[PDB]
């Protein structure tokens, strides 16, 4: 299936994914396309942080969902 990732540019990209793909897999698929290192990726869907070791199907992420990348402002 196809999903969308909005990156911190504003640019939205598509990724080929399966529901059984891990988050770290999706993270890796992002590096493949955008160059962004997986250790720097923090993904948000539907007001929820996505954790490593969970699949897209755990979050019920379906075709054409939009995931959002964010960065930390630590304080």
């Amino acid at each position: 299936m196809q999903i969308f990732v909005k990156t911190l540019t504003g640019k939205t990209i598509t990724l080929e994914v399966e529901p059984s793909d891990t988050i770290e897999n999706v993270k890796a698929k992002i590096q493949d396309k955008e160059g962004i290192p997986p250790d720097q990726q923090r993904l948000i869907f539907a007001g929820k942080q996505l954790e490593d070791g969970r699949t897209l199907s755990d979050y019920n992420i379906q075709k054409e969902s939009t995931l959002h990348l964010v960065l930390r402002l630590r304080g």
């Binding site: 640019k11 598509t14 290192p37 539907a46 929820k48 969970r54 019920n60 939009t66 630590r74």
Partner: protein
């Protein structure tokens, strides 16, 4: 003829447990309140579970549990006594006379078990500090050699950051001392002890903590330099980097829905709490809220911080954290505990309408999703002072190289009107499979509100990637309006006139021989419905380059787990499905049902609740991240109360007249009547 102390004592002796090494004895703070041995009235320690309770709260444990015997502590120099409920009989530690020995020995054994000048360095003036030192940051250090993140010494000679000594088992990996051993560089400072007033300076040479009169200048070498009251105006003690939690929590409890759930309803909550209430979400949240909206030098929410951080990779540590991440974490935690009961998250929750348009065919698809925070883009190109900023950056670069005082700060001034536009603007998406075209093409994506919430939460996406992929804070100035009309941004759904984008052997051997890939060849016989080699050849020729998903062909549980889920407010059937989907993993199963219930209910209907309203708002509160770094900073929040703006900086709560509504990070907009 009244009940004697001895009688009562003998009668509940079995409920006197004696603590062990691996036992938490809650001796310092009350479970239900912020009461402490230092509070008038003291603290009552249940001598069965080792839980603590202030004078107004012990009676709750008594009634709920049956426990009559408590060790009562009062500090003011500490005064201890045994108290039996309900008549509050007191027996002192040495009041055990005449009772059998084995009871005297049990009682005191239990009680005892429950109650468990620097000179200047010879080197401060002689100290050679090496040239071309590194620029040491204000937080987040690690030992240059191992991984350790606490217990790190900065050597004043060379800027090295290395871990402390081991012994006992606690400490560092000895990197710092071995570095002294190799170099002879005598002085180090304990990173994180650096206040305006001094630090912990250690001398390897004198094997001692020492003074350094020239600390300011030695630290400067590395680029290191050293009113409201009453209900709803409580400060929060810093627990070490807890400003992020303080800031969030302060905003939550300004919002009536959260007040009603956790503060107005605290009695019901305290009543429904399990034996150990220190571990209970609702109780702890209620306790926090009460301590903020009543009368109470501030509060130190150790108990809450400890619970809502349990098991979390970030919020269980004591390092600096992002406000949005904490917010969503607490929001999802509330969500887990409010299934089929009053859910205050409803005040935030809204529906996003996502629209795709295949640009080539003009065909559309509308998708829909829940969310809590709108993410506001910051389009740098919109900056109103590009040149005024470039002269600033030049002057700062110059002032660094010369090591002089930096120029007065200038920020890119970005219009809010631009951010809102960027939010709304249709956006081009490449490498999009159009089911209409049956070819990779280009889509136009748009985002709208399918619903406006009672309080709108806005995150300013004031960050981006710099070179070598280091995260940059965009230190930017965006005047967020006091008045927000976001109605032009309401989604309108699918429309009349708009067409929807569509969705969803001996032949195979002959085709693989020809040179077609096995995978395409399989899909070819299937999608032509076994009509012979010719038709299948035609298909692979049209469709071999297609993505897999465009033509797909599909080619015992535990009872302690089940009940845990059902207790969160689900059925048995629902619990079983979750576990069977998540390879029997509890945490994942929980993630599963929450994300899946809304769909499972629509199968129940086959035989998410959001509050709507106008998208017309007034600024209510904002959480501000201060600093230039992604990695360090301080958090404060401003909240508009009784018509007037108020800053909450940890312990400090003040009326502010000139709220910096242009430097904020997370914004909270309240809907108008």
């Amino acid at each position: 003829m009244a009940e004697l102390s001895e009688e009562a004592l003998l009668s509940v002796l079995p409920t006197i447990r004696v603590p062990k090494a691996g036992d938490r004895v809650h001796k310092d703070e009350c479970a239900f309140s912020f009461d402490t041995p230092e509070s008038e009235g003291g603290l009552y320690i249940c001598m069965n579970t080792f839980l603590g309770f202030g004078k107004q709260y012990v009676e709750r444990h008594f009634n709920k549990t049956g426990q009559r015997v408590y060790l009562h502590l009062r500090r003011t120099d500490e005064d201890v006594k045994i108290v039996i409920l309900p008549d509050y009989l007191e027996i002192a530690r040495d009041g055990l006379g005449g009772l059998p020995d084995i009871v005297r020995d049990r009682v005191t054994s239990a009680v005892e078990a429950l109650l468990s000048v620097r000179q200047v360095s010879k080197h401060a003036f002689s100290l050679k500090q090496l040239d071309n030192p590194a620029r040491i940051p204000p937080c987040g250090w690690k030992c240059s050699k191992c991984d350790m993140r606490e217990n790190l010494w900065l050597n004043l000679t060379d800027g090295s950051i290395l871990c402390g000594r081991r012994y006992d088992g606690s400490g560092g990996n000895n990197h710092a001392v071995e570095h002294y051993r190799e170099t002879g560089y005598p002085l180090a400072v304990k990173l994180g002890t650096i206040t305006p007033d001094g630090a912990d300076v250690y001398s390897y040479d004198e094997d001692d903590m020492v003074l350094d009169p020239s600390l300011a200048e030695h630290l400067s070498h590395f680029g290191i330099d050293m009113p409201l009251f009453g209900p709803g105006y409580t400060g929060i003690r810093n627990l070490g980097n807890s400003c992020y939690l303080n800031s969030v929590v302060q905003v939550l409890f300004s919002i009536p829905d959260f007040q009603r759930k956790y503060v107005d309803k605290l009695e019901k909550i305290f009543q429904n709490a399990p034996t150990d209430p220190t571990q209970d979400f609702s109780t702890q949240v209620a306790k926090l809220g009460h301590g903020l909206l009543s009368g109470e030098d501030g509060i130190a929410p150790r108990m809450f911080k400890a619970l809502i951080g349990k098991g979390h990779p970030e919020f269980s540590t004591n390092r600096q954290q992002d406000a949005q991440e904490f917010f969503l974490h607490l929001i999802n935690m509330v969500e887990r505990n409010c299934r089929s009961s009053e859910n205050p998250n409803e005040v935030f929750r809204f529906l996003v309408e996502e629209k795709i348009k295949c640009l080539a065919t003009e065909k559309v698809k509308y998708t829909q999703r829940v969310d809590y925070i709108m993410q506001l883009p910051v389009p740098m190109d919109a900056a109103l002072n590009k040149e005024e900023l470039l002269e600033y950056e030049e002057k700062k670069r110059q002032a660094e190289e010369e090591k002089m005082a930096l120029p007065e700060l200038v920020r890119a001034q970005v219009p809010f009107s631009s951010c809102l536009e960027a939010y709304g603007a249709p956006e081009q998406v490449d490498d999009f499979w159009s089911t209409a075209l049956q070819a990779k093409s280009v889509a136009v994506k748009t985002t709208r509100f399918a619903s406006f919430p009672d309080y709108l939460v806005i995150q300013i996406k004031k960050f981006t990637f710099g070179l070598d992929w280091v995260p940059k804070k965009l230190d930017v100035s965006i005047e967020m309006p006091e008045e927000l009309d976001i109605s032009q941004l309401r989604g309108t759904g699918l429309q009349p006139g708009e067409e929807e984008l569509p969705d969803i052997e001996s032949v195979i051997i002959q085709l693989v021989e020809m040179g077609f890939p096995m995978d395409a060849c399989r899909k070819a016989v299937y999608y032509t419905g076994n009509s012979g080699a010719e038709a299948a050849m035609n298909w692979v020729m049209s469709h071999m380059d297609d993505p897999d998903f465009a033509n797909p062909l599909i080619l015992p549980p535990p009872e302690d787990c089940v009940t845990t889920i059902v207790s969160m407010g689900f059925s048995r059937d629902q619990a079983l499905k979750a576990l069977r989907a998540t390879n029997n993993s509890l945490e994942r199963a929980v993630d599963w049902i929450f994300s899946h219930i809304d769909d499972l209910d629509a199968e129940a209907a086959m035989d998410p609740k959001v509050r709507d309203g106008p998208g017309k708002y007034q600024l209510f509160a904002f959480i501000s991240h201060m600093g230039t770094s992604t990695m360090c900073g301080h958090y404060v929040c401003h909240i508009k109360k009784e018509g007037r703006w108020v800053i909450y900086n940890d312990q400090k709560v003040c009326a502010s007249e000139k709220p910096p509504k242009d430097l904020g990070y997370i914004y909270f907009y309240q809907r108008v009547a």
